[PDB]
Design a protein around this ligand. Structure first.
Ligand SMILES: [Cl-]
Ligand SMILES: [Cl-]
Ligand code: NA
Length: 129
């Protein structure tokens, strides 16, 4: 599923991401824009052989099981395929664990390089929320 901006803002809010660990909703919407272009089915292989999955590009090295990341963990206790669903519940629940992990949203390289220190509220501007 390819979400619209406001449509995702609304779904993220409903799943309790808004100001989760102090990160305002625009942060999450901005991260999803630049991680996945709002596409739940996005996948990208990393040079280390791990793969990033879903609207928030969650990595198989630590967070989910894809059966081909030798030596990896599954700290979200999910198949990485769960992160590609049209329903964002699994991705949200897993993101909440990640952002609790110690470095906050810096875990998302795209957030650090494209969202952090920008006007992230712009990503929710005009949305009925
Ligand atoms: Cl694996
Ligand atoms: Cl933080
Ligand atoms: Na894994």
């Amino acid at each position: 599923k390819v979400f619209g901006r406001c449509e995702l803002a609304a779904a993220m809010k409903r799943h309790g991401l808004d100001n989760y660990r102090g990160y305002s909703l625009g942060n999450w919407v901005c991260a999803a824009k630049f991680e996945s272009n709002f596409n739940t089915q996005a996948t990208n292989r990393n040079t280390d052989g791990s793969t990033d999955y879903g609207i928030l590009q969650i990595n198989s090295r630590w967070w989910c099981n894809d059966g081909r990341t030798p030596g990896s963990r599954n700290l979200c206790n999910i198949p990485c395929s769960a992160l590609l669903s049209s329903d964002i519940t699994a991705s949200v629940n897993c993101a909440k664990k990640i952002v609790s992990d110690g470095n906050g949203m810096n875990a998302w390289v795209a957030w650090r390089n494209r969202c952090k220190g920008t006007d992230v509220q712009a990503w929710i501007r005009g949305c009925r929320l």
